[PDB]
Design a protein around this ligand. Structure first.
Ligand SMILES: COc1cc(-c2cncc(-c3ccc(C4CCN(C)CC4)cc3)c2C)cc(OC)c1OC
Ligand SMILES: COc1cc(-c2cncc(-c3ccc(C4CCN(C)CC4)cc3)c2C)cc(OC)c1OC
Ligand SMILES: COc1cc(-c2cncc(-c3ccc(C4CCN(C)CC4)cc3)c2C)cc(OC)c1OC
Ligand SMILES: COc1cc(-c2cncc(-c3ccc(C4CCN(C)CC4)cc3)c2C)cc(OC)c1OC
Lengths: 283, 290
């Protein structure tokens, strides 16, 4: 039989130290192609090993298509091929777009749904999975208004995370590394920061905050590990909740939720399943 | 496009196809889902650019593909029309020059695997056998199937045994594998398992080398002493309980080449793994034999 393999790379939609992401075409259909730098080969191996263990299929997880390794003269080429989401990342989307109550809740409940799917072991099924690098650049926006979680290069089944989004126990090196639940609680911290990023862009009484990343007012760009440790661990700062949120029932409820993702004590933080339940009871 | 033209092998592992790609023959292995951990391990091994060697099966691509709940696992390599050494020996006899060319090429490949390049880690194969050796039109061979391989880095003191429940082909398993006393955290243990298996492949090849008008029929190791399709315990009985080793046909002792080869394969078969020759010593010995 014929195995029509070739993907046409059409345009570069992201370039970094990780490598590059391209919009590509296969059999007349868009795919996303992540081409790994030599620097980040282990992310390709980890995500490939995970998908070789469990073929995740969930509306709020970026859809896997293929992992490809191709021999070159003097190098190995590593590609990850996934579904393509033309609206791009949540980070991208929040820069210019404002939200209403329905679109804000649909975004954050979709992320909570993807995260709970990763976290919960299913028997017969899937291992429990922690993401370890959850942030708004690792979430894509779909045309139907839901999001999906991307990049399982650091995922653990039962490179370090982005420093801006690191939980206090990672920064002060107290994390219980032998306890899988520790990794879930690190993702919940990061989820709370994403929930804050999104909620700022929800309009209430004609007011909205500009897009800012978590801790924009207390750390530099490309904050150091020490910069973050002083803010999060030593001074125990948390992102600001604007007064205008307390006039809006949705943002009042979202502020309570994000506070319950940011407890210093990791075992006090909400679970992804409890976050989903709380979000279904808002509005 | 890759075109799959004919199935050249099918078993519990999966299947291998002869295909065409960019106007050249290629081999396309499609793994069974039961053996997904071998696919991943083989892919980790082929990531190493300095693995490439005339006596190691050359890699083109590795793929995992999926839609919905089904996954395909592909390895694409160079294609060897002459097939495996196991196939080749069934029907062909050898002269001195051909016999030594085959076994020196396998020793060359195995020494390349075992010796670290400072890169390419040291590598132990763990399933060396005549079906896992391919015959090339130049009369040399190449070693195939790195799904069970173990890697070691001397500089960093790192041992990577991988995650694969697969075990070696029962017929070729060393005594310490069959009695399960092998030291699992010791890289040298895995090299010594490969040396045992190499000795068995030497014996399979040497049987097919003519001397004084005499040759033996092709037989797999231990053909005379175990059932068809021998179990793990069948092999443990003959190797560990009965202390059996392949018999040396007495006609070999009339031929200097086969006399030298019998000496070499016996030095691969010591029950004490640390007594066995290294791959490099075997290569050096075969380089000197004529
Ligand atoms: C190797 O590489 C790539 C391959 C492909 C690709 C192209 N056509 C068809 C296929 C296909 C899928 C599934 C089967 C099944 C049919 C049922 N049967 C019982 C088992 C086998 C056969 C064929 C694939 C996987 C795409 C790629 O990228 C888009 C590849 O590159 C990563
Ligand atoms: C986070 O990580 C990964 C993401 C993706 C991915 C999937 N769909 C779409 C995208 C994308 C498309 C388009 C734009 C721009 C282009 C035009 N205009 C400026 C608006 C938007 C940005 C982004 C990406 C980057 C794939 C990945 O792997 C293959 C990723 O890695 C796991
Ligand atoms: C990798 O990705 C894509 C792959 C394909 C594709 C191409 N040829 C064949 C297939 C296929 C056919 C049949 C089975 C069998 C499996 C067992 N049993 C007997 C029932 C069904 C499996 C697989 C597919 C899935 C299409 C895609 O898009 C339309 C893909 O997505 C980009
Ligand atoms: C061992 O392992 C792998 C081997 C191969 C491979 C490469 N070239 C040629 C072959 C071959 C061709 C033809 C026959 C003939 C001989 C017997 N009779 C006349 C019918 C069949 C046998 C063997 C193979 C099997 C590819 C692999 O991966 C793509 C292997 O896995 C790593």
């Amino acid at each position: 039989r014929t195995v029509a393999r070739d993907i046409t790379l059409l345009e570069c939609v992201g370039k970094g130290r990780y490598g590059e992401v391209w919009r590509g075409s296969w059999q007349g259909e868009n795919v996303a192609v992540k081409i790994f730098s030599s620097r980040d080969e282990k992310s390709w191996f980890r995500e490939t090993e995970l998908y070789n263990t469990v073929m995740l299929r969930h509306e709020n997880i970026l859809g896997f298509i293929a992992s490809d390794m191709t021999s070159r003269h003097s190098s190995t080429q590593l590609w990850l091929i996934t579904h393509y989401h033309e609206m791009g990342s949540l980070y991208d989307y929040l820069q210019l777009t404002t939200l209403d109550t329905v679109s804000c809740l649909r975004i954050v409940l979709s992320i909570a749904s993807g995260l709970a799917h990763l976290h919960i072991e299913i028997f017969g099924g899937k291992p429990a999975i922690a993401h370890r690098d959850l942030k708004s650049k690792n979430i894509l926006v779909k045309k139907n208004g839901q999001c999906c979680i991307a990049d399982l290069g650091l995922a653990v089944m039962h490179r370090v995370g982005t420093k801006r989004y690191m939980a206090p126990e990672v920064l002060d090196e107290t994390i219980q590394v032998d306890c899988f639940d520790s990794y879930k609680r690190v993702d919940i911290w990061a989820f709370g920061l994403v929930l804050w990023e999104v909620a700022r862009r929800m309009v209430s009484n004609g007011i909205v905050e500009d897009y800012k990343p978590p801790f924009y007012d207390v750390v530099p760009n490309d904050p150091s590990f020490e910069d973050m440790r002083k803010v999060v661990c030593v001074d125990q700062q948390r992102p600001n909740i604007p007064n205008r949120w307390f006039s809006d029932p949705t943002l009042t409820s979202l502020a309570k939720l994000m506070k319950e993702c940011w407890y210093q004590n990791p075992s006090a933080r909400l679970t992804a399943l409890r976050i989903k339940k709380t979000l279904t009871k808002i509005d």
